[PDB]
């Protein structure tokens, strides 16, 4: 029905070597059947504590998955979501300054 909108970001502005929280805010999707994995160099992170499933005014769900992570100079973090509307899983790389 409706495709998710993904934002991969950090709780605080990223400074390498300092602990932070990598958020993957998946919003606007329907139905609620979703799978979200936070990746470090393509490898799944464990403890991807997310939030409780709610929805907006237009009945579209929004879900926040967040890990604790330490940004580094050349390690790349991404969020891999999968939904009914997505033909293949769609991976959004975390941009340090976006």
């Amino acid at each position, epitope marked *: 029905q409706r495709t998710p909108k993904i934002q991969v970001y950090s709780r605080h502005p990223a400074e390498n070597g300092k602990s932070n929280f990598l958020n993957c805010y998946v919003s606007g999707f329907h139905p609620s059947d979703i799978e979200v994995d936070l990746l470090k*160099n*393509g*490898e799944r992170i464990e403890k991807v504590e997310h939030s409780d499933l709610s929805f907006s005014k237009d009945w579209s769900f929004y879900l926040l998955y967040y890990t604790e992570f330490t940004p580094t100079e050349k*390690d*790349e973090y991404a969020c891999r979501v999968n939904h009914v509307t997505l033909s293949q*899983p*769609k*991976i959004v*790389k975390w941009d340090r300054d976006m």
Partner: antibody
Amino acid sequence: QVTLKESGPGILQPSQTLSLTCSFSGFSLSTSGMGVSWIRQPSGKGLEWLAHIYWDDDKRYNPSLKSRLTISKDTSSNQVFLKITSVDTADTATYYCARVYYGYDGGFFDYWGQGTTLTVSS
Amino acid sequence: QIVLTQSPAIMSASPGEKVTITCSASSSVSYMHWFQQKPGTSPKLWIYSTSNLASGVPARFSGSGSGTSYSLTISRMEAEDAATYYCHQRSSYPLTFGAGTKLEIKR
């Protein structure tokens, strides 16, 4: 089917410039979570990872060869290029291009090319 | 850089012997991946994430370990198991392979 095929010179003189190309089929480098990486195997020694390019034109190099290595992609023609400037006899190896796909678990170098052997000597 | 050392540089086991390769990482790695390279061929993904068999990998193989010490195990060796096995990590982006554990048939 997923196919990767390296190409390049078979013999180079020292201090020359190496230009490898990896033309692939069966997958699109524009797909999210996709990447192609360059690994070389000196003769029979262990594997060494050289460079990696992402679906969003992000390049990761080996720090021991970062100044010499240059990686680029041409997703319109489905090719990945590697450039090693000022090659030495230590660059004699079989060069592999391997695909990396984040979409499904297990895409880390899931497919390799047959490898292009390169001899650098005078 | 996370440099990986495999304890047996050369390992001989007869068909039927349980084989255990061990990869030791200088720093903690989330996962360790294993590749098999029989001579004259490109390396083949074997254990794609620390326990998981790749496509076509025989069920006799198994991966284990966590942190800075991982292992590849053959429950019951076959003659076709003789090859070189490299342990590879992706946690730190200077991706490093192992020096290789040339697994040969004991005779």
